[PDB]
Each structure stands twice: as structure tokens, then as C-alpha cells.
Amino acid sequence: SVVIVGKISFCPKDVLGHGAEGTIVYRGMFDNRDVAVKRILPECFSFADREVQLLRESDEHPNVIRYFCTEKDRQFQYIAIELCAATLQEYVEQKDFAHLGLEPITLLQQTTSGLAHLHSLNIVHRNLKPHNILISMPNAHGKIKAMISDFGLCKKLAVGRHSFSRRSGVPGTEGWIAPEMLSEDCKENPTYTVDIFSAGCVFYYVISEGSHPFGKSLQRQANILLGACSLDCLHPEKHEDVIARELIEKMIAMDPQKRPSAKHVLKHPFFWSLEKQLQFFQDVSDRIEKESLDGPIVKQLERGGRAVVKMDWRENITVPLQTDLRKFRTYKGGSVRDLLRAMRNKKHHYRELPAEVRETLGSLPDDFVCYFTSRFPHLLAHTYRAMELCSHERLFQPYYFHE
Numbered sequence: 001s002v003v004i005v006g007k008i009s010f011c012p013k014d015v016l017g018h019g020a021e022g023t024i025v026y027r028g029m030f031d032n033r034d035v036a037v038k039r040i041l042p043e044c045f046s047f048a049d050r051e052v053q054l055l056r057e058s059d060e061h062p063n064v065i066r067y068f069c070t071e072k073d074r075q076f077q078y079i080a081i082e083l084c085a086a087t088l089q090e091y092v093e094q095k096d097f098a099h100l101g102l103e104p105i106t107l108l109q110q111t112t113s114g115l116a117h118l119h120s121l122n123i124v125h126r127n128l129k130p131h132n133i134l135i136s137m138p139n140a141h142g143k144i145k146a147m148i149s150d151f152g153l154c155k156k157l158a159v160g161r162h163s164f165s166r167r168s169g170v171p172g173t174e175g176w177i178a179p180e181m182l183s184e185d186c187k188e189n190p191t192y193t194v195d196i197f198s199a200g201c202v203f204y205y206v207i208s209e210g211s212h213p214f215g216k217s218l219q220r221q222a223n224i225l226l227g228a229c230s231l232d233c234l235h236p237e238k239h240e241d242v243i244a245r246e247l248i249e250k251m252i253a254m255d256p257q258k259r260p261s262a263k264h265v266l267k268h269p270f271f272w273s274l275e276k277q278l279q280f281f282q283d284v285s286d287r288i289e290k291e292s293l294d295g296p297i298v299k300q301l302e303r304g305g306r307a308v309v310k311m312d313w314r315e316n317i318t319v320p321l322q323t324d325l326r327k328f329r330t331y332k333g334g335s336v337r338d339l340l341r342a343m344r345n346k347k348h349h350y351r352e353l354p355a356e357v358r359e360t361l362g363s364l365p366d367d368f369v370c371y372f373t374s375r376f377p378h379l380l381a382h383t384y385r386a387m388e389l390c391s392h393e394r395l396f397q398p399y400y401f402h403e
């Protein structure tokens, strides 16, 4: 019943899954650890050593599946990796999100961290999808993490090239392949941003709890060539969906040059805590406090500002807050900058507002910054884009990725 091949033992009755072409995965043991064990044809009929070596160079990162050993003795080779709780697919399909909190977001973050590690090593993955993202068993503190796996299509690029030929292997998995991998008329070679495209689809798949930007399975790939995507799950007037839409629409752009790099994605407010959101608002208002209203920065900030502040943002805050501004008023209700100014001031003087004002805002910082983003769902997304003019400044390094 149990099979043994060196330090690797496994029972063939416990099949965890498949890969393709006689690829099979069993539950097993190596050393004294719980592993999953993928069985692959020998190197004669696999040509998998180059890609196992890439797994070797990458697996140090916590969000790249840890790889333990391979053994060759039999007809086959056996690759032992860390035994995991679920694929991301199973997680999205089988698990009640009501009770999970920010956990799905952090799995997206951890996946992006792992992908940024790969790209930093000049490795492109080329086959990212929920089935390929593993979820760890709980650690001693009951925490879990996502890990990139499945290196069968990974390529290391030479140091002078930032692209590879698209005729250079299987395109990937239907439904998750960047359009430049398949499109007929395409004068530009694929790059790292095929992973960002696939990642963008995974993001929506998670936060939509199982839907896909380009439709149901049978039209996905076709809609990808046509660029007919849809993010229906993202309400256009909820702060969190607004922020998520703004990132995902960039990750899945038809133009690969418009897609954010993984390090940019890691910086996006999609991943910011409330505390970090409020701190961004404060740093912005400090930055522009003595900027000319005619200057580039403020001008950029105010374009389209009326929709963001809802014409008169003073008629869109609770009354106890309205009366606290009038004490020393003079606030323009159409100015984004003056909305941020008010926020900065009430934050800075928070330990002094009247009780009813402190209670209408909520606790500093979590409830406080939600008082505003919930009332002006476009404010942060608007401010993030406008303030890219200062992304090169030491002040704004926590918020943007720059060289």
C-alpha cells in the first residue's frame, strides 16, 4: 500500500491532483515532513530540469512554494514540495468569506510579493491562475499564506532582454493567457507583464468570489483577444470597489505597457490599511498646503474635483461635523484640497473636538478615515492618481513605486 523511493515515501491511494500528460500528485512524506509529491516522466520525456532549477533559485521567498527534494530511482522522477491546505481555486470555491476578514486581500498581496520576487530574478511565470496558487496549512499561530507554484512554463530571461518569443512553448492555460500571447497581429514580444495580466484576473476572481473579468470559461479567451472585459462586481460608488477597479483595470489593460509592474501593484492603495489611507490623506494635505492654486499639483488635484466632492462636500457630512467647521470656516465646497484640509485639521485637533464631533467621526484612525471614504468613494482613488506628480519625492515613497 505505501511506496518508498529514497527519503520520499507516499501512498498512491492519496491522489491530491494532476498536472497534465501523466502528471500526478500524491500526499506523502519526506524526511519527517508532510509533502506533496508530483510524479513526472524522466528527463528523457519531461525536459523539466531547467525549470526545477528555477524553482530551486526562487523557493527561499515565503510566497514561492518551498521545494524539498527530487528522487529519480523509478521509471519516473518524484518532486517533493510543501504540503498545502488548498489551491486558491478551492479556497474561493469552498470557503465562506463572511468569516475571513481581510484574509483574501492578504493572499493577493502575498501572491504579488512572490511574483515580484520571481520577476526580480528575471523569471517570468507564464501560467498564473487560481489552481496554481497554493494556500499553506496554518502555522503555529494559525496564520496561512499563498505561494506561487507550478514552474513548468517559467523562463529565465537573459539580463539584456526583457521579452521572450511567444512561439517558445505552450501559451499557458486557456482563460488566463495575456492577449499578446495569442493575438494574430502582434508586433511586440511578451514580457513580464503577461504575469500581471494573469494576476489581474486572479484579483477579480478572488474579490468576486469566483467570477472572471472576461466572462465564463467558454468565452474567456475569446473575450481576452477582443478585450471585452467586465468588472460588474465592483460598485462604482463604494470606496473599496473603486480602488480595486482602478488597479485591476490597469493590470488587465490590452496594452502590456500600461500594466503595472508587480512592485507597483504592491504599492497600490488596494493593499493599504485604513491607517495608511489616512496617513496618505494627511501627507497630501501637508504637501499641498502652501502650493499655489494655479500650480501644477493643485490644478491636477482639482480637475474633476466637483464629482469627487459631490459639488458641495459641506452638504455631505454629518451635521455635528458641519457645525464644527463654521467655528473658523472659509472652506470651498467644490475644492478637493479643502476637503483634505478639513480632514487634516480635524485629525490633528481630534483630541480637542467636542464629544458629538468626536463621536460622529469615530475612533482615530480607523473609523475617522472611513467617515470620509464612505462619504466620498472616489476621493482616495482620485487623489492617488493626481498626486502621482510627487511620486518621486521622499515623502511619497510609502505610496508609489519609483526608481
Ligand SMILES: O=S(=O)(Cc1ccccc1)Nc1c(F)cc(Oc2ncccc2-c2ccnc(N[C@@H]3CNC[C@@H](F)C3)n2)c(F)c1F
Pocket: 016, 017, 018, 019, 025, 036, 037, 038, 040, 048, 051, 052, 055, 065, 079, 080, 081, 082, 083, 084, 085, 086, 087, 090, 134, 149, 150, 151, 152
Ligand atoms: O511547482 S512544480 O510545478 C515544480 C516543477 C517544475 C517543473 C516541472 C515539474 C514540477 N511542482 C508542483 C506543483 F506545481 C503542484 C503540486 O501539487 C499539486 N498539484 C495539483 C493540485 C494540488 C497540488 C497540491 C500541492 C500541495 N498540496 C496540496 N494539498 C491539497 C490541496 N487541495 C486539497 C487537499 F488535497 C490538499 N496540493 C506539486 F506537488 C508539485 F510538485
